[PDB]
């Protein structure tokens, strides 16, 4: 089967990395909204 | 990840391994390029929406759609 | 945090009267009612209802509940049983208004 | 007049950051989301000035 | 006076009952 080995996989590894890079921002976008309520503060 | 030696020990042909790798690089290429295409559609769609929203912000957002080039 | 102060101790104690189950636990006792000490202490805690002591009261209920109990100790198990049902009816509306 | 002149500005900037966050996606997005965070906090400051 | 209520009533909006 061997008819080098390292090069044929790193491309797909990077293509798998990029998708995760696309998915990692949404969770931060969800945490920011939770971080905004602590800064938000009618009067009776 | 090392399905090659798993196919050698279990008794499978790595031709379907590297074949699914060709379909994985092609399908992943169309997937990422599709995400960038729809994302560009959102970028110029929402960007043009802000363009017709206000004119004094149209000129700078044109710079935004013309930057990183 | 360092050692407390009598002002904060009495403040947190009178503010603890806003909780209904805590007042229920205070009234369902048998030792603190044999000697005229806890009643005179509750009647003593009436200075928080007047300025400038009223500027630190966070919960408006504890004060008025105190005035109710001081209003009731002047004139056993049954009435003590009577109050919490009514206050229970009152609570949730205010809770809705809070947040 | 007051903070109402700046709020607008901040608002106008927020969208301008959002566009950026859209145009990045790559691993650059992180850096951008930082700036976005700062903008939101500014909004909160002005509202604090509207509390009393 | 109203000056005590404009600065004291603002702390009554943030407050859950004590536990």
HSE-CB of A14 using CA atoms within 13 angstroms: 9
What whole-number distance in Å separates Cα of residue C82 and Cα of residue D52?
Answer: 41
What whole-number distance in Å separates Cα of residue C75 and Cα of residue B2?
Answer: 86
Helices (H) and strands (E) in chain C, counts: 5, 0
The data reach a resolution, in angstroms, of 5.8
Q: Please, what sign has the CA dihedral across residues A3, A7, A11, A12? A: positive
Chain B residues close to A18, C-beta within 8 Å = 32
Q: Under a CB-based contact definition with an 8 Å cutoff, are residues D32 and D20 in contact?
A: yes
Q: Under a CB-based contact definition with an 8 Å cutoff, are residues A31 and D36 in contact?
A: no
CA-to-CA dists, residue A2 to A8, A11, B22, angstroms = 12, 18, 17
DSSP label of C52: T
HSE-CB of C65 using CA atoms within 13 angstroms: 24
CB neighbours of C13 closer than 8 A, spacing ≥ 6? C45
DSSP label of C33: T
Q: How far is D8 from chain A (nearest CA, A)?
A: 18
Q: Which two tokens stand for residue C59?
A: 């919960």
Q: Under a CB-based contact definition with an 8 Å cutoff, are residues D49 and D10 in contact?
A: no
Chains D and C touching, counted as 3 or more CB pairs less than 8 Å apart: no
Q: How far is E4 from chain A (nearest CA, A)?
A: 13
CA-to-CA dists, residue C41 to C13, C36, C45, C61, C88, angstroms = 11, 9, 6, 18, 26
Q: Alpha-carbon dihedral of residues C74, C80, C82, C86, nearest 10 degrees? A: 90
SS (H, E, C) D7-45: HHHHHHHHHHHHHHHHHHCCCCHHHHHHHHHHHHHHHHH
Chain A residues close to B35, C-beta within 8 Å = 22
Q: Which long-range contacts (CB under 8 A, 24 or more apart) does E10-17 make?
A: E10/A43, E10/D51, E10/D52, E11/C58, E12/A43, E12/A44, E12/C58, E12/C60, E13/A42, E13/A43, E13/A44, E13/C98, E14/A41, E15/C58, E15/C59, E15/C98, E16/C98, E17/C18, E17/C19, E17/C59, E17/C61, E17/C91, E17/C95
Q: Which long-range contacts (CB under 8 A, 24 or more apart) does D25-28 make?
A: D25/A21, D25/A22, D25/A25, D25/B35, D25/B36, D25/B39, D26/A18, D26/A21, D27/A21
B21 — contact with chain A (CB < 8 Å)?
Answer: yes
Q: Which two tokens stand for residue A15?
A: 């293509």
Comparing alpha-carbon positions, the chain E residue that sits nearest to C58 is E12
């Amino acid at each position: 089967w061997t008819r080098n080995f390292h090069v044929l996989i790193d491309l797909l590894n990077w293509f798998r990395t990029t998708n995760m890079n696309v998915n990692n921002c949404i969770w931060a976008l969800k945490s920011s909204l939770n971080s905004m309520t602590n800064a938000k503060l009618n009067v009776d | 990840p090392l399905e090659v030696v798993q196919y050698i020990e279990d008794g499978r042909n790595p031709d379907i391994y590297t074949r699914e790798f060709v379909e994985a690089i092609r399908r992943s290429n169309q997937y990422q390029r599709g995400k960038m295409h729809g994302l560009k559609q959102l970028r110029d769609s929402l960007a043009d929406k802000i363009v017709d929203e206000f004119p004094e912000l149209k000129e700078p957002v044109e710079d935004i759609i013309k930057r990183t080039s | 945090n360092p050692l407390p102060t009598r002002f904060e101790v009495e403040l947190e104690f009178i503010q603890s009267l806003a909780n209904i189950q805590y007042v229920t636990y205070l009234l369902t006792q048998q030792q603190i009612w044999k000697s005229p000490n806890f009643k005179n202490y509750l009647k003593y805690l009436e200075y928080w209802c007047n300025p400038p002591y009223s500027q630190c009261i966070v919960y408006p209920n504890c004060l008025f509940i105190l005035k109710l109990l001081n209003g009731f100790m002047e004139s056993x198990x049954x009435x003590x049983x009577x109050x919490x049902x009514x206050x229970x009816x009152x609570x949730x509306x205010x809770x809705x208004x809070x947040x | 007049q007051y903070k109402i002149q700046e709020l607008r500005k901040l608002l106008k900037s927020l969208l301008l950051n959002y566009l950026e966050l859209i145009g990045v996606l790559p691993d650059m997005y992180e850096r951008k989301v930082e700036n976005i965070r700062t903008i939101l906090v500014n909004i909160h400051h002005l509202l604090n000035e509207y509390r009393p | 006076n109203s000056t005590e209520l404009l600065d004291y009533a603002t702390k009554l909006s943030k407050f859950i009952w004590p536990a």
